[PDB]
Amino acid sequence: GIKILLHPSGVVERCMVSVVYNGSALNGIWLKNVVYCPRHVIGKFRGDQWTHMVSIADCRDFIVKCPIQGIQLNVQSVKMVGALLQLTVHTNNTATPDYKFERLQPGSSMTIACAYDGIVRHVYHVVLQLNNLIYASFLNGACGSVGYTLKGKTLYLHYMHHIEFNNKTHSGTDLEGNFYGPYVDEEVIQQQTAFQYYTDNVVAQLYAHLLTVDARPKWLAQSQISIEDFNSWAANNSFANFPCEQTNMSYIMGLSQTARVPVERILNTIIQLTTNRYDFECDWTPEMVYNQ
Amino acid sequence: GIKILLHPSGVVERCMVSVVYNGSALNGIWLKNVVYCPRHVIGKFRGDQWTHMVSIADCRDFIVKCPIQGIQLNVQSVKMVGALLQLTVHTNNTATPDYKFERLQPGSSMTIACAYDGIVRHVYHVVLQLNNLIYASFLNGACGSVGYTLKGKTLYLHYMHHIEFNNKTHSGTDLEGNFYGPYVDEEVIQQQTAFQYYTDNVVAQLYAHLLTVDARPKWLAQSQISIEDFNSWAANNSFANFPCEQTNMSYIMGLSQTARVPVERILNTIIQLTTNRDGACIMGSYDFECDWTPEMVYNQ
Ligand SMILES: *C(=O)[C@H](C[C@@H]1CCNC1=O)NC(=O)[C@H](CC(C)C)NC(=O)[C@@H](NC(=O)C(F)(F)F)C(C)(C)C
Numbered sequence A: 001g002i003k004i005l006l007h008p009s010g011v012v013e014r015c016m017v018s019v020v021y022n023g024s025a026l027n028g029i030w031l032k033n034v035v036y037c038p039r040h041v042i043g044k045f046r047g048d049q050w051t052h053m054v055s056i057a058d059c060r061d062f063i064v065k066c067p068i069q070g071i072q073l074n075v076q077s078v079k080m081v082g083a084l085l086q087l088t089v090h091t092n093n094t095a096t097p098d099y100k101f102e103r104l105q106p107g108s109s110m111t112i113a114c115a116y117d118g119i120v121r122h123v124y125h126v127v128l129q130l131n132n133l134i135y136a137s138f139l140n141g142a143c144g145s146v147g148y149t150l151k152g153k154t155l156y157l158h159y160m161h162h163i164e165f166n167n168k169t170h171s172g173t174d175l176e177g178n179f180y181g182p183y184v185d186e187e188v189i190q191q192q193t194a195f196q197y198y199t200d201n202v203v204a205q206l207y208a209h210l211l212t213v214d215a216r217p218k219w220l221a222q223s224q225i226s227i228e229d230f231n232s233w234a235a236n237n238s239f240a241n242f243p244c245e246q247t248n249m250s251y252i253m254g255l256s257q258t259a260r261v262p263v264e265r266i267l268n269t270i271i272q273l274t275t276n277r278y279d280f281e282c283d284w285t286p287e288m289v290y291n292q
Numbered sequence B: 001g002i003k004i005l006l007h008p009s010g011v012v013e014r015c016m017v018s019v020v021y022n023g024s025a026l027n028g029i030w031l032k033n034v035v036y037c038p039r040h041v042i043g044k045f046r047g048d049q050w051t052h053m054v055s056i057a058d059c060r061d062f063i064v065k066c067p068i069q070g071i072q073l074n075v076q077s078v079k080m081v082g083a084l085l086q087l088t089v090h091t092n093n094t095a096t097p098d099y100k101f102e103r104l105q106p107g108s109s110m111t112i113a114c115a116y117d118g119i120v121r122h123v124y125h126v127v128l129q130l131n132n133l134i135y136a137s138f139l140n141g142a143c144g145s146v147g148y149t150l151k152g153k154t155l156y157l158h159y160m161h162h163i164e165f166n167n168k169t170h171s172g173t174d175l176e177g178n179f180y181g182p183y184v185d186e187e188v189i190q191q192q193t194a195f196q197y198y199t200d201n202v203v204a205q206l207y208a209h210l211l212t213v214d215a216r217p218k219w220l221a222q223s224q225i226s227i228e229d230f231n232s233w234a235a236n237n238s239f240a241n242f243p244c245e246q247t248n249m250s251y252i253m254g255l256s257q258t259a260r261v262p263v264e265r266i267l268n269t270i271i272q273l274t275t276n277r278d279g280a281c282i283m284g285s286y287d288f289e290c291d292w293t294p295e296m297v298y299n300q
């Protein structure tokens, strides 16, 4: 069948640590001799206050533990890189894998390893939406949880949790310390970009339905529409211009011959399905549906 | 938010191993000094041929390796328990956690750690259906992959994969060697019982939609139907008798309160949706999903 595929959290679990600073506690990941955690554990500051507030944070206050290895690390250097803190410790993590800090483009998926007190409690699947927010699930003390993927032996880190917004949305930074979207780690109302459907993922979801549930459903459109006529419709109906990624076409084309339904009909079905309308319609990437 | 939550797989990766027997390769789990793996690694036998074929199987032909620990295991004795092989090794797994073999009932969820060659490649979420099948995703060499849950420190093993049927459905045994349902590890057509929706889980899906997507969607029924009037309809529309588990009512009654929508409207919505859905996408699904359990939607 066709399922939402997640990446095994084992390599991330061995690197997770807990970071507690003067009553505030969150999570952090431990790679080589550096621990990466959100900067707001030292306090809730704004704008350019961070440089100076990090400069006076004494390392003896950074209590860092890695429960899965039963060792308490000692901080020696503290450096702010973006909106993250790089905590240099004496002990090198023997469980460090070959990794890479890869930034996500909107529409791509990743595995969140939701962690509390330095221990991963849940893992689940999210996709970065065009508003640069993820629709996830976090409670107090979850900041520092990472979103990742895996390509063979290499851990690809994409995300670290920072803040939750009113409409059940979440934003954080990449492991280089830069937020996704115009969002910051400040507890104020922040304007969001209007939502837009990642069209390639909507098309991938419908094809997954025809390949597993029903080869010919009733709501499927009988007539085609051109990509051009769809893209003119999409510019006024909050749908992204198709195709979002030119590299998704070889997947979608292969999916359409497997399903014996040209993408023109799927696009038309998307337009006809606007009668029936957060939404969760873009969790299925064309790669994940085609490869499996 | 309300998400499909999987259990962290690191405990299972440290215990996974690969078992190869005369060109046949599949996975296995290694707890204490015994390896568990499906019995058809020694051949594709039928009926009661297993006990004789296992008793003549040379332990020197079992090539067992644990790639995450760099250990190659040596098999002392082999005994068949149910449809599973228990391969005694000379080395105790140091990473063995406190575990328990717990058989699932239909309607309950578990995390599948899909492995190949002793290494888990994908983890995903499935729910045991009333036909005692799971709707999963497996290729050749994936047998031996386990489904599991975690309650704090104890690892709860529920399932080990053995066979895939034509309609993209999968079956296997619990870790005690007994299949779920009347299915066996033989490559012939086996009658499956008709599909039936786990009503408690479909109720939990619509409640999940009301709590994170849209509180008052256009397809939510305005009128109610009683549980009994629903169960009369359920017997003719492939829906289980509500409730499937009495223990789900404490969760469902909780979801009713915070959503300000009683379960009677959810049940009447289920009935209306079977005739006037026309492509509505509930919780990211164009289908009735049994993947959302009331406990998972209510707890998180
Ligand atoms: C870090 O672990 C916590 C966790 C939050 C709370 C539950 N969901 C989460 O992800 N993050 C914060 O408390 C964060 C601190 C800032 C200094 C970064 N603040 C928030 O997420 C707040 N949100 C806002 O005030 C908002 F931005 F206006 F939305 C709440 C109110 C604590 C959620």
Ligand SMILES: *C(=O)[C@H](C[C@@H]1CCNC1=O)NC(=O)[C@H](CC(C)C)NC(=O)[C@@H](NC(=O)C(F)(F)F)C(C)(C)C
Pocket (backbone or CB within 6 Å): B025, B026, B040, B043, B044, B045, B138, B139, B140, B141, B142, B143, B144, B161, B162, B163, B164, B165, B166, B170, B184, B185, B186, B187, B188, B189
């Ligand atoms: C063990 O690793 C595999 C897992 C399979 C491979 C394809 N998808 C899976 O989940 N088990 C088998 O290949 C199994 C071996 C028997 C001796 C138990 N055979 C099958 O699953 C076959 N299915 C049938 O013949 C069926 F029962 F009629 F459906 C196929 C045809 C190889 C899938």
